[PDB]
Amino acid sequence: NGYENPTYKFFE
Amino acid sequence: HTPEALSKHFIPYNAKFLGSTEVEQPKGTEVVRDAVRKLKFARHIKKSEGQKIPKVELQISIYGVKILEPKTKEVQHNCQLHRISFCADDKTDKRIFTFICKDSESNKHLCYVFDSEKCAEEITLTIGQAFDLAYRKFLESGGKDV
């Protein structure tokens, strides 16, 4: 049980 | 918990901090399991040196995860939520949970590994909820801000 952060990709 | 708690304040938790270690990817089950194993090996070595792993307090919010020295409440890391790519519990050890944060300093991915007696699953879910709320705010701003 894990979660990716959808916002991450936009701040890289 | 509620939106408001994550959004307007923070949720505190106690944990032990096994450390952080550099990883190659921002996500993935294998990646985090290899990290947890590395840090369990290091911790076992340190215990044979007579060391305890440090206790920390975590403050989870839509803005990030702060890692505090629990007595002084002094901030030792602030992991901005938008630099945390992934959080997971460990399916083969209830108490272990982790997240991957892209380092301010170095461009490297760091996996932070922790131990919580009772709350590992709950902590992991809380960070997931933070991701959800922060992403919704992000979309509602049409992609802008901070």
Curated annotation (Swiss-Prot), chain B:
It is found in: Cytoplasm. Widely expressed. Detected in macrophages, pancreas, kidney, skeletal muscle, heart, colon, intestine, lung, placenta and ovary. The keyword Isomerase does not apply. Residues 7-146 form the PID domain. The keyword Coiled coil applies. One of its GO terms (biological process) is phagocytosis, engulfment. The modification Phosphothreonine is found at T2. Keywords: Apoptosis, Coiled coil, Cytoplasm, Lipid transport, Phagocytosis, Phosphoprotein, Transport. Its main location: cytoplasm. GO terms for cellular component: cytoplasm. It comes from the Eukaryota. Homodimer. Interacts with clathrin. Interacts with GDP-bound ARF6, but not with GTP-bound ARF6. Part of a complex composed of GULP1, ACAP1 and ARF6. Interacts with ACAP1, LRP1, MEGF10 and STAB2. May function as an adapter protein. Required for efficient phagocytosis of apoptotic cells. Modulates cellular glycosphingolipid and cholesterol transport. May play a role in the internalization and endosomal trafficking of various LRP1 ligands, such as PSAP. Increases cellular levels of GTP-bound ARF6. Belongs to the ced-6 family. This is PTB domain-containing engulfment adapter protein 1. It comes from Homo sapiens (Human). The lineage of its organism: Eukaryota, Metazoa, Chordata, Craniata, Vertebrata. The chain holds residues 15 to 160 of 304 of the full protein.
